[PDB]
């Protein structure tokens, strides 16, 4: 599914994103647009060390979910890959939360410290009445 900016603003809302970890909404969003274009059935195969991001989020296999063909793979948030490609976001959301709960928070994801940090966000959430 890809959702539409909005529809996807009041979805986080409603799932306790805004202000987890000290994460606004808006900084959430901007992550998702940049990773995935809002799109949950995203994936994208890093051939250099075998692991494969998946789902709105883009959430690593090596990591934070297994995929059964990831070397290394730890699986934090003890979750078949497979439900980071549903077009419900809820397992999706629960493990974006473990992985913000390390001391990086959303620094995790480099595409967040390209293009988002230190930037104006604002733009991602208004009128969507969040």
């Given at each position: 599914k890809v959702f539409e900016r909005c529809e996807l603003a009041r979805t986080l809302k409603r799932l306790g994103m805004?202000?987890?970890?000290?994460?606004?909404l808006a900084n959430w969003m901007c992550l998702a647009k940049w990773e995935?274009?809002?799109?949950?059935?995203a994936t994208n195969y890093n051939?250099?060390?075998?692991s494969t991001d998946y789902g709105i989020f883009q959430?690593?296999?090596?990591?934070?979910?297994?995929?059964?063909?990831?070397?290394?793979?730890?699986?934090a948030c003890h979750?078949?890959?497979?439900?980071?490609?549903?077009?419900?976001i809820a397992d999706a959301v629960a493990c974006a939360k473990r992985v913000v709960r390390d001391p990086q928070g959303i620094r995790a994801w480099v595409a967040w410290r390209n293009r988002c940090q230190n930037r104006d966000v604002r733009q991602y959430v208004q009128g969507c009445g969040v």
């Open positions: 805004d202000g987890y970890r000290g994460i606004s995935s274009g809002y799109n949950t059935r051939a250099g060390d075998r959430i690593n296999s090596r990591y934070w979910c297994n995929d059964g063909k990831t070397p290394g793979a730890v699986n979750l078949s890959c497979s439900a980071l490609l549903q077009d419900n």
